[PDB]
Amino acid sequence: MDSRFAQLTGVFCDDFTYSEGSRRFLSSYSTVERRPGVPVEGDCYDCLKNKWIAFELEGQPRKFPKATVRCILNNDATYVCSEQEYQQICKVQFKDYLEIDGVVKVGHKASYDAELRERLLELPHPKSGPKPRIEWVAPPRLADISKETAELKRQYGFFECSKFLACGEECGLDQEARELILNEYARDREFEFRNGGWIQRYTVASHKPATQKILPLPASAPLARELLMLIARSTTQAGKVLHSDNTSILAVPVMRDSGKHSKRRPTASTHHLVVGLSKPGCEHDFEFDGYRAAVHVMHLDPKQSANIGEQDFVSTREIYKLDMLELPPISRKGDLDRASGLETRWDVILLLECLDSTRVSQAVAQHFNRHRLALSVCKDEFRKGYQLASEIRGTIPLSSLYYSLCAVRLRMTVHPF
Amino acid sequence: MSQFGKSFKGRTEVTITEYRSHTVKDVHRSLLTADKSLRKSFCFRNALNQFLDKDLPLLPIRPKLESRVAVKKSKLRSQLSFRPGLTQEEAIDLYNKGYDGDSVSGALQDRVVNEPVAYSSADNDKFHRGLAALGYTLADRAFDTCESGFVRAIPTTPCGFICCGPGSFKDSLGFVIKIGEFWHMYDGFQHFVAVEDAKFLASKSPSFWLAKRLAKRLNLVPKEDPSVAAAECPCKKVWEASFARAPTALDPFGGRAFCDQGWVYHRDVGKAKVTVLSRSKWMGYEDLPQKPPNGTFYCRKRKAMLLISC
Amino acid sequence: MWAFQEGVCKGNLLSGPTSMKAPDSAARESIDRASEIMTGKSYNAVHTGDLSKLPNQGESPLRIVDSDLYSERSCCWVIEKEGRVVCKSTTLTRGMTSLLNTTKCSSPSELICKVLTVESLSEKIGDTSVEELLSHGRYFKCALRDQERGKPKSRAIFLSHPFFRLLSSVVETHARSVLSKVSAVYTATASAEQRAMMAAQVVESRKHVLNGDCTKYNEAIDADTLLKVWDAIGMGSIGVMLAYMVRRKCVLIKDTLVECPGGMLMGMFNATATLALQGTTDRFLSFSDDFITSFNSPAELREIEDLLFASCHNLSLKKSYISVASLEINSCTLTRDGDLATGLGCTAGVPFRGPLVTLKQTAAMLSGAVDSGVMPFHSAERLFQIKQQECAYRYNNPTYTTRNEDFLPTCLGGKTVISFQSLLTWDCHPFWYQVHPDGPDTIDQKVLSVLASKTRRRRTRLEALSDLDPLVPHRLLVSESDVSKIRAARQAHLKSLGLEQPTNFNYAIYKAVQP
RNA sequence: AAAUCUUUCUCAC
RNA sequence: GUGAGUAAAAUUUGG
Ligand SMILES: [Mg+2]
Ligand SMILES: [Mg+2]
Ligand SMILES: [Zn+2]
Ligand SMILES: [Zn+2]
Ligand SMILES: [Zn+2]
C-alpha cells in the first residue's frame, strides 16, 4: 500500500465492466471505489475473478500476500502479470509512459561510492608511456622478401625428401601390397596389437621440440583430395589400415605404457600417428617380400586432424582459379624455373596450406593484401609483419610459411604491382 | 527432493526465461567435432531415417519463384528487407493447430535484414536472396510509406535510403549542395546550378521544385538566368553515395542536413484497441454483447476472447 | 595462390588455426604485457583527451535485458570451500542461477536494485554481501580462442563472473547507446559493408586515407580510462564498482591466481574503449581497435597521431598503412568512390562438417558472393555442382546413409544433383528446402544440437518447459507446480489432435504457402 | 615415437 | 549406457 501507485492504478481501469456495467476493477486508493469492511491486500480488486492486483516497479517487490496478483512494470516499457487478461489490460491502458517515483537510475550514487573511489585512488595507477616516432615510407620491395626467404632458408635448411608431403602421389603399389606394407611397418616399430588394431606406446618424452626444416615440393599432388578424405576418416576410425582408390593410410593411437592395465581405447584427447606411403628413394624406405615403399609419419592431435581432414581442396582450387593470373613454373625449392619448373607444384603448395593446422599462410596473405593496397607504411615495422617464424613451430608450418613468402616473391617478380 | 528445488535452491519462484535457459537444445555451433559426433552410434543415420519416415511427409509444398526483371550491374549498395511478424490471432491459431510454440513465438517480432547487393533495375526493386544477378524480385509492396519515415525523427521501418535511415537517395528525393560559390540542386533526373547576384536566385530553371525550396531556404527571389553554369559537379557521385541519417526532425524548410551546407528534400512533403487474448472460450466469463463498453468477452462470430479498451 | 589473385584476397578459403595447446602461456604473456604497459615503458595507458562533449545518461532508467544474461557460453563461478577460492567453469545460465540463489533474488534486475541500495558493504544480500560480491567477481579463468584466421599463435580469452557480466552488460548497453547518439555511423542496424560504405563517403573529401589498427588494444585500456568514460556518460556507482573489480582482477592460470592490474582482458568493454577515442574527436571512424581517418597534409597526420596517442589508441606500426585509392575497414575493402574492390576479398570456404549442413553453408556463401558481385552466377553454379560432387565423395557411405531414394542428394545415397538456381528458386523436392539458406535447419544441425544439449556442462534433469504459448511472457515467474500444470495441459491438447511431438515451423515456407 | 609440459581422470549402478 | 566427483570432460572457447 504505497501512494506512488495511486495514479498508476487510477488509469489502469478506466471503465472496465464485469457483469453488465459495474466496474470490474475497484481501486483501493479511492474511497468511492474501495470496498468497505474488508482489508486491503492489493492495489485493485477484480470482481469477476475476485482477485487482487498489485503494481510494483522492476525488481522492487511490495509487502503483499502471495495470493495477490503482482503486476510488475519493467523499465523498458513492458509490463507483467500472472493473468494474461490483466497483462493485456495494463499494456493497452498504459500506452502513456508515466514515470513513477522510486525507479533506480543508472547514474544512481550508492552509499559506498566514496569508499570505493578512495580504495581505487589508493590502488596503483599506470604511468604515461613514451610518444612514438613514426616514419612513413614506401612499402617493402622485392629485395626485402628475398632477404626474408634467404634468412629462413639459411636458418632452417631443407629436408632431403618431402616427407609426408610426398604422400600426395601414388606409391606404385596395389591395395593388397599397400595394406601388407603398412601392417608390416607397424609390426616392425614394435607397435602393440590389440583388438585387431595397432597402438603406439610411449613411456618417456625428451620434452624438446622436434627438428624442423623445409620440405621440398614434389612434382604434383593428384591425390590431395583422397589424402584429405583418408586423414579425416582415419583419426575417427583409428587402429586399422584405411584404403582409398589409389592410396591407403594407417592411423595408430598413441597412448602411455603404464603396465598390465595401461589403456585399451583412445580418448577424445588421444593423439594419432598417421602413416602414409610414397615412392621409394629416401631414408624412409621400407622393404618386405619384394615390395618397397617410402613410409612417412605425421603426429597429429585430434583438433589438428579434424582441421586438416575437413578442408575442401577441389573447391578451393576452383575458387582460386576463378580470378587468378598465370602461375609461373617453380622448382623444388620454390624458385622460379622457366626452363625445368612445373606449374603443378602450385597444387602441392595448396596441399601444404591444407596440411598446416597453424595456417600461417593466412597471416602472410593478410599482410600481402595490406602490402598491395598500401601506399605508405611505417618504417622498419611493416616489414617485420612478414617475420612469423617465432609465431610457429614445426616442419609443416615452417614449410608453409616459407612457401607463402616464396609465393609473394614470385608474384612480385612475375606480375609487379 | 525435486529437481526444481535442487536447481533453484532457496527460491520457490523463477522467471520463465531462466527456467527455459536451463533446457535449451536448439542451438547449433560449427565445430571441428561434427564428423565424429555424427558418426558416433550412427546418430545421423537414425535421424535421417526418422526424418524420411516420420517428418518428411509433413512439409508443405510451396511454390517456386517465377517473377524476375531485367537487371544490370551497378554500384554496391545496401538492401533492407522487412519481414513482418505474425499477428496475435495468427500466432494463437498456429499454436492451437499444434505447431511448435517456440518457433511461432520467435517469429512474432518484425525482422529487418541487411544485404549488400551490386545489381539494380530500372524500377529499383528488391531481389531474393542470391538471385539479384538473375533479377528475381520480392513482389511485395508493404505500403512503402517513406513519407512517414522522412518526417519522423526515428522512422519505424528503414527502407535502406537516406529518407528513412543510412543509405543513398531515392527517386522522389533531391538534394541541394553548395559547391564553392554555387548551389547544385539534383533530383536524380535533372541537375541545375543556382547563384545569387544581389538578392535573387539566378538559375536556368527557377520553376524547379528544388530551386523553389533553395530560394525559400535562402530567402531570395527566383530569377531566370541561363548564364549561370558550373565547371563540373559530383552530383551523380553524392546521389549514389550513402550518408548517415540524423535522428532529428525536418527543418521548417523541410530539409534535413546530410552534409556540409547540404540538405535533402522530399517532393511529396511540403476508438478501441480491440485485442484477441486467445482462440478459446474461458469458463466463467461474460458473453460478447452488442455494445461492450470496456470489458473482455467471448465472440461467437470468431471463437476468441476479445478485450475492448476505451 | 592467394598471392596471384588479380584483385584483393585475404586468403580466407581455408579454416582458421587450431590446436590443443594449453591457454596458460598466452594468458601469461598478455598479463606480462599489461604489467609492462603499466610501468610506462612500452605503450601509453594514461588517457589525456577531454570527454566533456559526451552526453550524460545518469538520469536514464536502469534497465537490464535478461536474455543476454543467460547463455550456453562458458563462465566462471567462485565458491569458498573452507577459506580458499575455487573457480569452476560452468555455463553462463548456471552461473547466473547460482548467483541468484546465493543472493535470493528472483531476477537480475532485482539483484542490481538490491545491490545499489545497501547502507554499507558489510550488509547482507541473501547469503552474501556487496564486499564479498566484489571480491568474488574479480576472478577470471583463461581459455584459448582458436580458429582466428591470420593468427598462427592463438590468443587467450577470459571467462568472468556472473556479477561482472551483469555490470558489464549494463554499462556496455549504455555505452552503445551513447555511441549511437554521438555519430550516426554507429546505428544498431548497420552491416560491415554498410559501415564501410558510409566511411568511404565520409573520407572521400581528403586525399590520403589512414587505415589503422591498435596494437595490444586490450592491455592498453586501463581501469582509469574506463572509469573516466563511465563518469563522462554518467554511470554512477556501477562504473565505480566495475573499475574497482577490473583494477583488482585476478586470472586463474592453470592452478595459480595471477594479478593483472592493467588492461580490460580481451574485449570485456568494446563500446567504452571506442568512446575513449570517439569522445575526444570527431575525425575518426573507429570500431573496437580498427579505425580509419583522412588527411591532406603532414600536419594533419601529426594531429591524427597526437589524438590517437592522447586517446590511448596506440597505433600499430605493423599493420597500419596509408592509401589513396583503397579504403579498408571491418575487413571490407572499397574504392574511394564507394564501390567494392574486385577480387575474392573476405570470401571464406565451407569445410566439410556434415552432408547437408555443408551444402547449406555453401549455398549461403555463394548467394552472398553473387549478390555482391564477387563472382558471376554461372561460376557460382559450377562451384555448387563441384561442392555437391565433393560431398558425395565424402558422405556417400553406409556409415551416413542406408537409403537410395531418387530425390535424395548423391551424398545421401540418391541420384539428384540439384542446380544452384533451382535450389534458390525453390524448384526442388521439399527435402531440399533445408539446404536453402533461408530454409529450416538440416537434419545434421538438429542432431548436433540435441547431442550438445546432453553434454556434462549443460545436461540437466529438469523437466523441459518447451513449446510455450506465444502470449505468455518469457519473463513471468513460475513454480514447479506451474511448470507441471502447463506441461500437462500442452501434452493433453496435443493428444487431442493426434500428435506426440510439435510440428517444426518455418516462417519462410509458411508465408510462401499462404494463399 | 612426434607439429614434444601434450599424447590425460576417479567412483557407483 | 546411466549417473556422480575433481579449478576440465570436448556446444570445448569469452566479449
Ligand atoms: Mg590491433
Ligand atoms: Mg583489428
Ligand atoms: Zn622420406
Ligand atoms: Zn525511404
Ligand atoms: Zn552538380
PDB file of C-alpha atoms in Angstrom, chain B residues 3-4 7-9 11-25 27-32 34-35 37-39 42-45 47-49 51-53 56 58-65 73 75-76 78 83-86 88 90-92 94-105 108 114-119 128-132 134 136 166 242-245, chain C residues 18 70 72-73 93 97 100-101 105-106 184 191 193-194 197-198 201 334 337 339-340 353-355 361 364 367 370-373 377 395 398-403 407 412 421 424-427 430-431 433 437-438 443-445 447-451 453 458 460-471 473-480 483 490 493 497 502-505 507 510 512-513:
ATOM      1  CA  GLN B   3      14.952 -31.162  -9.362  1.00  0.00           C
ATOM      2  CA  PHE B   4      13.312 -27.732  -9.176  1.00  0.00           C
ATOM      3  CA  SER B   7      18.424 -26.252  -9.104  1.00  0.00           C
ATOM      4  CA  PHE B   8      16.716 -23.116  -7.753  1.00  0.00           C
ATOM      5  CA  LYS B   9      17.574 -23.895  -4.143  1.00  0.00           C
ATOM      6  CA  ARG B  11      13.798 -19.897  -4.418  1.00  0.00           C
ATOM      7  CA  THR B  12      10.241 -21.125  -4.977  1.00  0.00           C
ATOM      8  CA  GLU B  13       9.551 -18.843  -7.962  1.00  0.00           C
ATOM      9  CA  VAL B  14      11.651 -18.156 -11.069  1.00  0.00           C
ATOM     10  CA  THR B  15      11.207 -16.333 -14.360  1.00  0.00           C
ATOM     11  CA  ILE B  16      10.213 -18.396 -17.389  1.00  0.00           C
ATOM     12  CA  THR B  17      13.284 -17.173 -19.283  1.00  0.00           C
ATOM     13  CA  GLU B  18      15.595 -18.513 -16.570  1.00  0.00           C
ATOM     14  CA  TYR B  19      13.774 -21.855 -16.495  1.00  0.00           C
ATOM     15  CA  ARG B  20      13.940 -22.218 -20.280  1.00  0.00           C
ATOM     16  CA  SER B  21      17.623 -21.260 -20.398  1.00  0.00           C
ATOM     17  CA  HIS B  22      18.403 -24.458 -18.474  1.00  0.00           C
ATOM     18  CA  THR B  23      16.789 -26.676 -21.146  1.00  0.00           C
ATOM     19  CA  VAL B  24      17.926 -25.015 -24.377  1.00  0.00           C
ATOM     20  CA  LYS B  25      18.668 -27.610 -27.050  1.00  0.00           C
ATOM     21  CA  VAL B  27      21.496 -24.012 -30.596  1.00  0.00           C
ATOM     22  CA  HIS B  28      23.910 -25.152 -33.311  1.00  0.00           C
ATOM     23  CA  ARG B  29      27.654 -24.488 -33.428  1.00  0.00           C
ATOM     24  CA  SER B  30      30.035 -25.238 -36.294  1.00  0.00           C
ATOM     25  CA  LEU B  31      32.911 -27.153 -34.701  1.00  0.00           C
ATOM     26  CA  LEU B  32      35.720 -29.492 -35.711  1.00  0.00           C
ATOM     27  CA  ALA B  34      30.894 -32.521 -36.214  1.00  0.00           C
ATOM     28  CA  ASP B  35      32.016 -35.576 -38.192  1.00  0.00           C
ATOM     29  CA  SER B  37      29.619 -36.630 -33.394  1.00  0.00           C
ATOM     30  CA  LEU B  38      27.579 -37.618 -36.450  1.00  0.00           C
ATOM     31  CA  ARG B  39      29.417 -40.939 -36.780  1.00  0.00           C
ATOM     32  CA  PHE B  42      25.010 -43.803 -36.293  1.00  0.00           C
ATOM     33  CA  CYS B  43      23.048 -40.893 -34.852  1.00  0.00           C
ATOM     34  CA  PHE B  44      22.878 -39.108 -38.207  1.00  0.00           C
ATOM     35  CA  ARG B  45      21.795 -42.315 -39.949  1.00  0.00           C
ATOM     36  CA  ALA B  47      17.972 -39.144 -37.678  1.00  0.00           C
ATOM     37  CA  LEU B  48      17.859 -39.362 -41.477  1.00  0.00           C
ATOM     38  CA  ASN B  49      15.682 -42.475 -41.308  1.00  0.00           C
ATOM     39  CA  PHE B  51      13.092 -37.678 -40.927  1.00  0.00           C
ATOM     40  CA  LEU B  52      12.352 -39.705 -44.061  1.00  0.00           C
ATOM     41  CA  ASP B  53       9.713 -41.938 -42.440  1.00  0.00           C
ATOM     42  CA  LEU B  56       9.493 -35.657 -44.471  1.00  0.00           C
ATOM     43  CA  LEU B  58       4.666 -33.285 -43.344  1.00  0.00           C
ATOM     44  CA  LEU B  59       6.423 -30.344 -45.039  1.00  0.00           C
ATOM     45  CA  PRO B  60       4.007 -28.248 -47.134  1.00  0.00           C
ATOM     46  CA  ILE B  61       4.809 -27.886 -50.825  1.00  0.00           C
ATOM     47  CA  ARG B  62       5.497 -24.214 -51.509  1.00  0.00           C
ATOM     48  CA  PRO B  63       5.504 -22.578 -54.952  1.00  0.00           C
ATOM     49  CA  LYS B  64       8.665 -21.723 -56.845  1.00  0.00           C
ATOM     50  CA  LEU B  65       9.764 -18.188 -57.654  1.00  0.00           C
ATOM     51  CA  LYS B  73      25.491  -4.470 -62.651  1.00  0.00           C
ATOM     52  CA  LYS B  75      27.479   0.259 -57.682  1.00  0.00           C
ATOM     53  CA  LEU B  76      27.453  -1.693 -54.443  1.00  0.00           C
ATOM     54  CA  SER B  78      22.614  -1.952 -49.187  1.00  0.00           C
ATOM     55  CA  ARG B  83       9.676  -9.240 -42.905  1.00  0.00           C
ATOM     56  CA  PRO B  84       6.622  -8.523 -40.716  1.00  0.00           C
ATOM     57  CA  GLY B  85       5.892 -10.774 -37.771  1.00  0.00           C
ATOM     58  CA  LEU B  86       2.818 -12.831 -37.006  1.00  0.00           C
ATOM     59  CA  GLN B  88      -1.600 -12.189 -32.379  1.00  0.00           C
ATOM     60  CA  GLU B  90      -2.500 -15.895 -36.395  1.00  0.00           C
ATOM     61  CA  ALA B  91       0.060 -16.917 -33.769  1.00  0.00           C
ATOM     62  CA  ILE B  92      -2.663 -18.191 -31.435  1.00  0.00           C
ATOM     63  CA  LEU B  94      -0.977 -21.685 -35.266  1.00  0.00           C
ATOM     64  CA  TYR B  95      -0.341 -22.708 -31.659  1.00  0.00           C
ATOM     65  CA  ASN B  96      -3.797 -24.296 -31.486  1.00  0.00           C
ATOM     66  CA  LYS B  97      -3.122 -26.160 -34.737  1.00  0.00           C
ATOM     67  CA  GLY B  98      -0.296 -27.928 -32.902  1.00  0.00           C
ATOM     68  CA  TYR B  99       2.744 -26.051 -34.174  1.00  0.00           C
ATOM     69  CA  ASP B 100       5.929 -25.636 -32.152  1.00  0.00           C
ATOM     70  CA  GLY B 101       5.144 -22.785 -29.790  1.00  0.00           C
ATOM     71  CA  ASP B 102       8.761 -21.658 -29.510  1.00  0.00           C
ATOM     72  CA  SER B 103       9.232 -21.121 -33.248  1.00  0.00           C
ATOM     73  CA  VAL B 104       5.853 -19.406 -33.640  1.00  0.00           C
ATOM     74  CA  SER B 105       6.563 -17.053 -30.733  1.00  0.00           C
ATOM     75  CA  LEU B 108       6.243 -12.620 -33.687  1.00  0.00           C
ATOM     76  CA  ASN B 114      20.565  -6.142 -44.456  1.00  0.00           C
ATOM     77  CA  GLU B 115      22.279  -7.486 -47.576  1.00  0.00           C
ATOM     78  CA  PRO B 116      24.918  -5.911 -49.858  1.00  0.00           C
ATOM     79  CA  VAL B 117      23.766  -6.008 -53.488  1.00  0.00           C
ATOM     80  CA  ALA B 118      25.714  -4.948 -56.585  1.00  0.00           C
ATOM     81  CA  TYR B 119      22.794  -5.156 -59.043  1.00  0.00           C
ATOM     82  CA  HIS B 128      15.604 -12.507 -53.490  1.00  0.00           C
ATOM     83  CA  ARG B 129      18.495 -13.946 -51.506  1.00  0.00           C
ATOM     84  CA  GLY B 130      21.213 -14.743 -54.029  1.00  0.00           C
ATOM     85  CA  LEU B 131      19.067 -14.012 -57.105  1.00  0.00           C
ATOM     86  CA  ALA B 132      19.829 -10.309 -57.594  1.00  0.00           C
ATOM     87  CA  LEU B 134      19.355 -13.066 -62.269  1.00  0.00           C
ATOM     88  CA  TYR B 136      14.192 -12.415 -59.146  1.00  0.00           C
ATOM     89  CA  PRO B 166      21.501   5.278 -43.668  1.00  0.00           C
ATOM     90  CA  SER B 242      25.293   6.819 -48.889  1.00  0.00           C
ATOM     91  CA  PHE B 243      25.131   9.242 -45.954  1.00  0.00           C
ATOM     92  CA  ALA B 244      24.082   8.821 -42.345  1.00  0.00           C
ATOM     93  CA  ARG B 245      20.555   9.737 -41.266  1.00  0.00           C
TER      94      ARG B 245
ATOM     95  CA  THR C  18      43.567 -24.694 -34.143  1.00  0.00           C
ATOM     96  CA  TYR C  70      21.753 -16.407 -19.813  1.00  0.00           C
ATOM     97  CA  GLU C  72      25.180 -21.798 -23.077  1.00  0.00           C
ATOM     98  CA  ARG C  73      28.533 -19.995 -23.222  1.00  0.00           C
ATOM     99  CA  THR C  93      22.953 -19.660 -17.292  1.00  0.00           C
ATOM    100  CA  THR C  97      21.222 -19.172 -11.415  1.00  0.00           C
ATOM    101  CA  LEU C 100      20.564 -15.520  -7.809  1.00  0.00           C
ATOM    102  CA  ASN C 101      20.287 -18.477  -5.428  1.00  0.00           C
ATOM    103  CA  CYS C 105      16.910 -12.564  -5.903  1.00  0.00           C
ATOM    104  CA  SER C 106      14.132 -13.576  -8.284  1.00  0.00           C
ATOM    105  CA  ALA C 184      25.009   8.256 -36.855  1.00  0.00           C
ATOM    106  CA  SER C 191      26.335  -4.146 -41.621  1.00  0.00           C
ATOM    107  CA  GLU C 193      29.665  -3.348 -45.768  1.00  0.00           C
ATOM    108  CA  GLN C 194      27.190  -0.574 -44.936  1.00  0.00           C
ATOM    109  CA  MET C 197      30.425   2.497 -47.497  1.00  0.00           C
ATOM    110  CA  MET C 198      29.449   5.232 -45.048  1.00  0.00           C
ATOM    111  CA  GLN C 201      31.768   8.658 -48.213  1.00  0.00           C
ATOM    112  CA  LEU C 334      36.170  -0.474 -51.068  1.00  0.00           C
ATOM    113  CA  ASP C 337      34.038   6.019 -54.829  1.00  0.00           C
ATOM    114  CA  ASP C 339      32.383   0.575 -54.878  1.00  0.00           C
ATOM    115  CA  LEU C 340      33.528  -2.850 -53.727  1.00  0.00           C
ATOM    116  CA  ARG C 353      31.098 -30.533 -41.342  1.00  0.00           C
ATOM    117  CA  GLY C 354      28.173 -32.706 -42.394  1.00  0.00           C
ATOM    118  CA  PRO C 355      26.485 -33.865 -45.602  1.00  0.00           C
ATOM    119  CA  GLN C 361      26.604 -23.165 -45.790  1.00  0.00           C
ATOM    120  CA  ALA C 364      24.699 -19.169 -48.289  1.00  0.00           C
ATOM    121  CA  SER C 367      24.479 -16.406 -52.543  1.00  0.00           C
ATOM    122  CA  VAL C 370      26.881 -13.497 -56.315  1.00  0.00           C
ATOM    123  CA  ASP C 371      24.597 -10.886 -54.746  1.00  0.00           C
ATOM    124  CA  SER C 372      27.513  -8.542 -54.005  1.00  0.00           C
ATOM    125  CA  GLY C 373      29.095  -9.104 -57.426  1.00  0.00           C
ATOM    126  CA  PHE C 377      26.200 -16.506 -61.344  1.00  0.00           C
ATOM    127  CA  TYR C 395      29.469 -38.813 -47.238  1.00  0.00           C
ATOM    128  CA  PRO C 398      26.790 -46.721 -45.268  1.00  0.00           C
ATOM    129  CA  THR C 399      28.040 -45.008 -42.101  1.00  0.00           C
ATOM    130  CA  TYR C 400      25.973 -41.931 -43.028  1.00  0.00           C
ATOM    131  CA  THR C 401      23.083 -43.292 -45.111  1.00  0.00           C
ATOM    132  CA  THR C 402      21.349 -46.585 -45.887  1.00  0.00           C
ATOM    133  CA  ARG C 403      18.849 -45.031 -48.322  1.00  0.00           C
ATOM    134  CA  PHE C 407      15.119 -37.462 -54.795  1.00  0.00           C
ATOM    135  CA  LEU C 412      22.801 -39.295 -49.144  1.00  0.00           C
ATOM    136  CA  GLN C 421      19.372 -21.621 -59.462  1.00  0.00           C
ATOM    137  CA  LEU C 424      17.467 -20.814 -54.701  1.00  0.00           C
ATOM    138  CA  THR C 425      14.204 -20.587 -56.679  1.00  0.00           C
ATOM    139  CA  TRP C 426      12.512 -23.329 -54.590  1.00  0.00           C
ATOM    140  CA  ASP C 427      12.156 -25.500 -57.707  1.00  0.00           C
ATOM    141  CA  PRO C 430      10.706 -30.431 -50.356  1.00  0.00           C
ATOM    142  CA  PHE C 431      13.610 -32.443 -48.920  1.00  0.00           C
ATOM    143  CA  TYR C 433      14.206 -26.950 -48.544  1.00  0.00           C
ATOM    144  CA  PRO C 437      19.963 -20.750 -46.818  1.00  0.00           C
ATOM    145  CA  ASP C 438      16.604 -19.470 -45.524  1.00  0.00           C
ATOM    146  CA  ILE C 443      18.984 -32.992 -40.047  1.00  0.00           C
ATOM    147  CA  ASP C 444      22.638 -32.881 -39.000  1.00  0.00           C
ATOM    148  CA  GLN C 445      22.170 -29.478 -37.357  1.00  0.00           C
ATOM    149  CA  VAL C 447      21.342 -33.952 -34.373  1.00  0.00           C
ATOM    150  CA  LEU C 448      24.344 -31.904 -33.262  1.00  0.00           C
ATOM    151  CA  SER C 449      22.173 -29.531 -31.226  1.00  0.00           C
ATOM    152  CA  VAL C 450      20.406 -32.336 -29.361  1.00  0.00           C
ATOM    153  CA  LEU C 451      23.706 -34.119 -28.727  1.00  0.00           C
ATOM    154  CA  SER C 453      22.270 -30.330 -25.030  1.00  0.00           C
ATOM    155  CA  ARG C 458      24.714 -28.409 -19.918  1.00  0.00           C
ATOM    156  CA  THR C 460      20.051 -31.282 -16.571  1.00  0.00           C
ATOM    157  CA  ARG C 461      17.301 -33.437 -15.078  1.00  0.00           C
ATOM    158  CA  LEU C 462      14.830 -30.533 -15.058  1.00  0.00           C
ATOM    159  CA  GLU C 463      11.540 -31.106 -16.857  1.00  0.00           C
ATOM    160  CA  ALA C 464      11.889 -29.102 -20.061  1.00  0.00           C
ATOM    161  CA  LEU C 465       9.436 -26.212 -20.471  1.00  0.00           C
ATOM    162  CA  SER C 466       9.258 -26.141 -24.267  1.00  0.00           C
ATOM    163  CA  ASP C 467       6.562 -25.369 -26.838  1.00  0.00           C
ATOM    164  CA  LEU C 468       5.047 -22.493 -24.885  1.00  0.00           C
ATOM    165  CA  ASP C 469       2.007 -20.474 -25.840  1.00  0.00           C
ATOM    166  CA  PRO C 470       3.230 -17.369 -27.717  1.00  0.00           C
ATOM    167  CA  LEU C 471       1.303 -14.992 -25.425  1.00  0.00           C
ATOM    168  CA  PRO C 473       5.886 -13.667 -21.457  1.00  0.00           C
ATOM    169  CA  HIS C 474       9.266 -15.333 -21.025  1.00  0.00           C
ATOM    170  CA  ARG C 475       9.863 -13.020 -18.040  1.00  0.00           C
ATOM    171  CA  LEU C 476       6.928 -14.246 -15.913  1.00  0.00           C
ATOM    172  CA  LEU C 477       7.568 -16.112 -12.664  1.00  0.00           C
ATOM    173  CA  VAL C 478       6.647 -19.798 -12.382  1.00  0.00           C
ATOM    174  CA  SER C 479       6.993 -22.629  -9.856  1.00  0.00           C
ATOM    175  CA  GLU C 480       7.287 -26.402 -10.169  1.00  0.00           C
ATOM    176  CA  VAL C 483       5.560 -25.962 -14.874  1.00  0.00           C
ATOM    177  CA  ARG C 490       0.104 -28.847 -23.566  1.00  0.00           C
ATOM    178  CA  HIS C 493      -4.063 -30.680 -26.019  1.00  0.00           C
ATOM    179  CA  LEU C 497      -5.395 -33.754 -32.155  1.00  0.00           C
ATOM    180  CA  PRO C 502       5.180 -30.498 -32.211  1.00  0.00           C
ATOM    181  CA  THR C 503       5.380 -29.687 -35.905  1.00  0.00           C
ATOM    182  CA  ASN C 504       8.501 -27.757 -36.884  1.00  0.00           C
ATOM    183  CA  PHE C 505       7.587 -24.232 -38.003  1.00  0.00           C
ATOM    184  CA  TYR C 507       8.275 -18.751 -41.372  1.00  0.00           C
ATOM    185  CA  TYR C 510       4.585 -20.776 -44.125  1.00  0.00           C
ATOM    186  CA  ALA C 512       5.098 -18.642 -49.177  1.00  0.00           C
ATOM    187  CA  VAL C 513       2.336 -21.250 -48.893  1.00  0.00           C
TER     188      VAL C 513
END
